[PDB]
Amino acid sequence: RLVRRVVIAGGGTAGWMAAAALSKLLGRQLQITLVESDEIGTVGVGEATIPSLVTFHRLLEIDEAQFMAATQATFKVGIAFEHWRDVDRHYIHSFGHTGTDHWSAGFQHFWLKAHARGVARDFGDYCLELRAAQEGRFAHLPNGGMNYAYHLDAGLYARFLRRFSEGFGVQRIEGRIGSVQTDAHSGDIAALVLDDGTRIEGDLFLDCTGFRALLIGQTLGVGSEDWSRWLFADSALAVQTESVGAPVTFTRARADRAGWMWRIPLQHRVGNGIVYSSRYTDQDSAAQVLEHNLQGRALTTPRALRFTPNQRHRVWEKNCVALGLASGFLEPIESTNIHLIQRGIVRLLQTFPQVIDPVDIAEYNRQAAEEIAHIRDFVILHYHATDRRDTAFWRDCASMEIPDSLRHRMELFRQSGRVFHQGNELFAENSWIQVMLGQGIVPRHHHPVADLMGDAELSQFLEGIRQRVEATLARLPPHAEFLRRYCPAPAPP
Template sequence: MQTDPTTDVASQPVQRVVIAGGGTAGWMVAAALSKTLGKRLDIKLIESDEISTVGVGEATIPTLMTFHRLLEINEQEFMAATQATFKLGISFENWRDVGEDYIHSFGVTGKDHWTAGFQHFWLKGRERGLARDYGDYCMELQAAAAHRFAHLPRGGMNYAFHMDAGLYARYLRGFSERFGVQRIEGKIVDVQRDATGTSIRSLRLESGVELEGDLFIDCTGFRALLIGQTLGVDYEDWSQWLHCDRAVALQTASVGPAVPYTRSIARDAGWQWRIPLQHRVGNGLVYSSRHLDDDAATRTLLSNVEGEVLTQPRVIRFQPGQRRQTWRGNCVAIGLASGFLEPIESTSIHLIQRGIVRLMQMFPAAGIRQVDIDEYNNQTRAEIEHIRDFIILHYHVTNRQDTAFWRGCREMAVPASLRHRIELFRESGRVFRVPNELFAENSWIQVMLGQGLVPRQHHPVADLMGDDELSAFLGGIRSAVQATVQRLPAHQAYVDQYCRRTEAAAAG
């Protein structure tokens, strides 16, 4: 393999792709590569049945639908295969303060003016006693609160999914194998670097088989066997802002109809999730080990679940942060091997997807070039830092002072980029969105208002409306939302008729 450090990492065309690790990340990579480039690539995926995956990334955000459209995946088939339900947002309970709740939905709230967002008209209406809760003007939020759902014409409902992560990996495995991906069962016991020491030459399995490749995808989870242990890419620790570093997870039987939102319930030293699927409920407690030990966390979770416990509690340890590079040499890390924030806004699968799409856009068919590696790493870092700030916002902007954990979150110094967003909204009611940023203005507004941050002023364009005009404007939006939501069927009933998994499908 010829190399030129000034231009090419490897001038040999990429034809052999080796994916180290399965799970959600590995099989998403395999599915995308095989569907789009399978005819020109030799794709192998190595995974061992003896190595368990984290398998708790069961709540998604709407961007997953884009991934499925690219792969031409049938939604009903996917939902039946993964026991999926619909998700319209996240219910944040006890986050602003104990006993105070709000929903961060996937929808658009109200109607903007070209000079100012809807929040300015809402703030004016609130000042004049003409406005209801901010969430009253968002259809997806009201549908979630009413436990209703349906597909609407012209993509009129923004939604995502709750799904069984293990079944999703199995579904994508079948999809990938139809497009030529070869799965190899085995444990990786050695990683051989090339002569330069900056790239990978081959992986050796416990069976003695050695697999060479031109491009290696590290999907080995927190172990980061290739990018971290072998190539030595450092990990940047963000625990000064994200204090939670543990999760304990288990599954319970369903005790009622599935709701179309994830529940995020703040506890004394972290928060608890509830994710309703067709056949069960996923549960977990994300917590800070500095404030709660594993045994106490397990007891807290067990005392706050509903329904029969189906699995043994499993403790997952993680360090919030990001690899300083996610692509080095001929190795790209995707999924947990590249970094992890925490599951609060269901961004893990999105970041897998973005890593895949970015790789597809820069795929080194003619050879790996340093300029592509640098661009990939720069884009990855910018994206995850914006998501990091959004997640920190949930912890830092709060009225809770009842425990050491929450006092520490309130009092910590936050990144300057987040501090600017908070101060801008507090002083002016304005938000801004960086190009290609995941969370739109309405997400920032919903969470900032939900966490108790109310702007001190609104845009003067809202003052041009008299009380009668403003009341009619706000009332018309709210009435339209109510009328639409009232026509929607119950979420559970819609799931049952749209994508209920049959016994025959389950057996297959």
């Protein structure tokens, strides 16, 4: 049966990112219908992103400045990780690349040798994007020389994508789903039945219904793998504050006693939140910690969220593809939520069915499983690589068993300073290095190629890199000045 009708269950970022991409590419031959309820809204929730979204908008021919102005967006070049290695020990995990590699050995080997010889500055001084986070500067550079992403209002983003999608013929139906129907012989989803009795028939259904996974889970019975043995957070509180100064170019991830706090700058507001574990603390205490750390007064009543670190066992089952929370969830410590939605959509478009076949489904599921396990391991790394023993939460994080896949990467770096990137893993070599060095893993050896340079040659190699970083950084304007010239957003009412 030819796939001619796609029904998207749920709106928000997952549903409207899917509608936007599907209608842009295939909307001239597909009937695309999205069902969502006006009773759900996310406007005024700030969210951080990663550079894959730049590519997504290139594929969709979305104008960056128009998108940013419509979503109150600012630029992002990294995440400032405060108090993770230990209290008062901070580092930045930035985009980009540090230093110059040799074909046999990455830059970190030269930096490690130089540091042992006392001729190295901080590892981050050799990375432009990291310095741009420290100094609050941003502009685009020729030939994609600046690696960046965005801080955005997720509700305004969904609204922008809705306008885009409706322009490519997406049919929006306002309502709630009262029943999901299956086919008696195949087990496929046949239709959704709305709360007014309307049956919406389709060939392929996207489950964007959130954490309940109404289609792939409650209807088709696909369970999820629970990761709470490794990842203890299960709660969040979020609140916006007034801006108190020019927008920084980084997201802040500030560890506390039993969780951590995000701070995300938008053009005229700041998004804040605390992520914590209900098995170690309670909502009242977390609200107190969040309030204590806010700059400026809160503008909204805090919004509470409950979640589980998890992954749907298969993200494509029969004629249903899950996206967003219905496919899984990891806390926003590395800003991966919108990325995982995008990956599910782009992979679906690259495997789009003429007819649906098990071999396509199996390949899709294999890729999704591999990609998410890699991101999970990197999230676990943030909690497990810590010197902190000051609360039960941190002692438990440091002492837990971890996936063998993560243990092997940590051991490789600890022994020989080596990191290796595979396939379509999200996190690049630079990310593994910045985070492991930043959180206190010290390689016992470095690559022998770095020992070929004497002290003066090695010091000059590093210093040349650092001078080029500083010379480039000096040409970049303050963030707020660039925003004003490139993508000024209207002041909220």
